[PDB]
């Protein structure tokens, strides 16, 4: 059960952020005055990772220097970081074949695309992955899911519809829809090959993507075998389901608690407002993870670090955070 290795997909969703990612990398950008990687690394440490892998090509030098300065190059760290240097801008499938050629994957490995902040304990996830792997031999990868904000009417970038089992929690279909932004398409066609094998069909759009994966040793061998697969969700999951290799299973995990992957600007804005609020119970500014952080919680959701300078007769609002060594003038809201 022990010894766990992780692979992080960086250089993945660049230029998806339109004005930025020009000089400095995607994941260097701060959410709450602290880099996005730091959140992911904290999730790795809480999960129990012994060996860390990172995928850097574009602005790779700045990433490597940041890891040099990081809290994990120091000997006491539970994990060690090794960077993968690849050709500039390639699909996830191409990187998977590169890693299989190098051959470091042992048993069960971890793959995360993008940077995700979640308060969900991973120890439960590992156990249920292992329990379901002991159920049948040909079982592959694990997917995370969380319940949405009642209706996803504001969420347009992630229109992923999931068809799931009530008994075994196996995914059946993945579909993207333009619906509310572009009223053009309405139809969704589903394969009727798995009708009586499941019986208890459950179709949901009210679930948020996470793109966090627990994967077996089968995965890198399949990527090299079928080099036509470029993506990991849109074509790959659907390809696995639609009788590519008969008798192969993939997991879908439901969790009540908060887990949202960063992808767009207006999603980033909501996650940030959720972090300022007490949505992520452990993940709060006051606990201080970067060690240099000296944030203190104040009532009405107001965050202030040490050495905060403020002018007299100034009003502060709700769900606000201010860094260290900061000066503010009069008449400010």
């Amino acid at each position: 059960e022990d010894r766990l290795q992780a692979v992080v997909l960086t250089d993945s969703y660049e230029t998806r952020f339109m004005p930025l990612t020009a000089v400095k990398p995607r994941c260097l950008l701060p959410l709450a005055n602290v880099p996005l990687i730091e959140y992911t690394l904290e999730f790795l440490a809480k999960a129990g990772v012994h060996e860390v892998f990172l995928i850097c090509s574009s602005h790779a030098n700045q990433i490597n220097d940041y890891i040099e300065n990081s809290k994990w190059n120091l000997p006491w760290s539970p994990f060690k970081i090794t960077t993968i240097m690849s050709p500039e801008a390639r699909c996830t499938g191409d990187v998977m074949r590169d890693l299989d050629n190098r051959g470091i994957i042992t048993g069960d490995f971890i793959l995360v695309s993008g940077d995700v902040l979640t308060n969900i304990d991973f120890s439960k996830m590992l156990e249920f992955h292992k329990k379901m792997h002991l159920q049948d031999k040909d079982h592959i990868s694990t997917m995370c899911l969380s319940k949405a904000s009642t209706y996803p009417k504001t969420r347009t970038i992630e229109p992923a519809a999931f068809v799931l089992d009530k008994s075994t929690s196996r995914c059946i279909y993945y579909q993207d829809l333009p619906l509310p932004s572009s009223r053009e398409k309405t139809s969704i066609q589903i394969d009727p090959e798995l009708l009586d094998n499941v019986d208890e069909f459950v179709i949901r759009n009210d679930l948020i993507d996470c793109r966090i994966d627990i994967c077996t040793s089968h995965v890198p061998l399949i990527f090299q075998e079928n080099f036509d697969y470029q993506s990991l969700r849109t074509d790959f999951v659907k390809g696995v389901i639609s009788s590519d290799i008969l008798g192969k299973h993939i997991y879908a995990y439901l969790t009540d608690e908060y887990a949202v992957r960063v992808e767009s600007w207006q999603t980033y804005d909501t996650i940030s407002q959720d972090f300022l609020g007490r949505w992520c119970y452990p993940l709060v500014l006051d606990s201080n993870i970067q060690d240099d952080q000296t944030y203190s919680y104040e009532s009405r959701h107001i965050y202030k670090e040490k050495d905060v300078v403020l002018a007299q007769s100034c009003k502060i609002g709700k769900c606000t955070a201010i860094g260290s060594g900061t000066k503010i003038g009069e008449g400010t809201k």
């Binding site: 104040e298 403020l310 002018a311 007299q312 100034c314």
Partner: protein, 302 residues
């Protein structure tokens, strides 16, 4: 050689040389002339000079308290039955070292007692002590947000004096009368006070309206503060609400007058009980309730 005359010479000075610390320094100078080798010749003449000082006192309490601590230190010197000369040299030197300790204590408190004033808190300040104002100034030096409300105390008009000293710093203020002081306790976070003395019981010896402040704050449940330098402790136990050492009037009722001359007379110094004080601040740590008495028991060994 005189001691009352030496204390009278401090007119335009003050501020740095605190009123008791200047009287203690005057006690050491009078000691070091006529040989501290003899304990019969010197101590008796020191006792006579303190008695002459008390007889010349109009409305001061702290000078009597400061004498006690001096005496105590003198007696404690040769408690090790040490050389009647190195013990003496250490006693004479502990006069300038006593005044130097007033600076070190103020350096301690102004970093400890800034913690009590939180993010954006409106303060109603009453009285004037060098410790409380030093907290107020070195919090402004710490760049912290606080509002200030001035109480119209009536001894030698202290409110106006306090208001002008707050103007020289750069902190927004307005005059509040001690009559209307009840109507302020809702827009005030915390109430602060500077004391003339702190009781054996745990109560306070203060100015022309401080008990009244203490009770109103107890009604409004809003905190009540006492901040001072640790030398204003007497073995005094004011048993009742209106009993204090006085040279002038303990409430006098005058006859029928037409020219209007005999009027003013009211209790200029008033006591408040132990229950009304929420917090007390000195250089001797952060302590309030039974702490004062334990200090006095430790000193007096009785």
């Amino acid at each position: 050689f005189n001691i009352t005359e030496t204390y009278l010479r401090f007119l335009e000075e003050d501020t740095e040389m605190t009123m008791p610390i200047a009287a203690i320094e005057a006690l050491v100078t009078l000691l070091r002339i006529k040989t501290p080798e003899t304990a019969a010749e010197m101590i008796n003449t020191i006792k006579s000079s303190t008695e002459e000082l008390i007889k010349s006192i109009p409305n001061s309490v702290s000078l009597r308290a400061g004498c006690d601590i001096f005496m105590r230190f003198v007696l404690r010197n040769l408690h090790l039955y040490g050389d009647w000369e190195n013990c003496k040299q250490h006693l004479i030197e502990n006069g300038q070292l006593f005044v130097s300790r007033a600076k070190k204590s103020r350096n301690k408190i102004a970093e400890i007692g800034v913690d009590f004033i939180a993010d954006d808190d409106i303060i109603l300040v009453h009285g004037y002590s060098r410790a409380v104002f030093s907290l107020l100034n070195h919090a402004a030096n710490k760049f912290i947000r606080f509002r200030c409300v001035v109480t119209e105390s009536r001894p030698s008009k202290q409110g106006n004096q306090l208001y002008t000293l707050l103007e020289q710093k750069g902190i927004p203020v307005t005059l509040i009368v001690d009559s209307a002081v009840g109507a302020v306790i809702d827009k005030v976070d915390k109430v602060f006070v500077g004391a003339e003395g702190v009781a054996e019981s745990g109560g306070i010896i203060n100015l022309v309206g401080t008990y009244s402040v203490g009770v109103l704050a107890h009604n409004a449940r809003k905190p009540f503060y006492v901040v001072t330098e640790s030398h204003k402790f007497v073995r005094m136990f004011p048993l009742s609400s209106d009993d204090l050492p006085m040279a002038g009037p303990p409430l006098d009722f005058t006859r029928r007058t037409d020219d209007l001359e005999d009027a003013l007379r009211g209790p200029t110094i008033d006591y408040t009980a132990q229950e009304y004080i929420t917090a007390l601040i000195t250089d001797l740590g952060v302590l309030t309730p039974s702490a004062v008495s334990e200090e006095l028991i430790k000193m007096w060994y009785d």
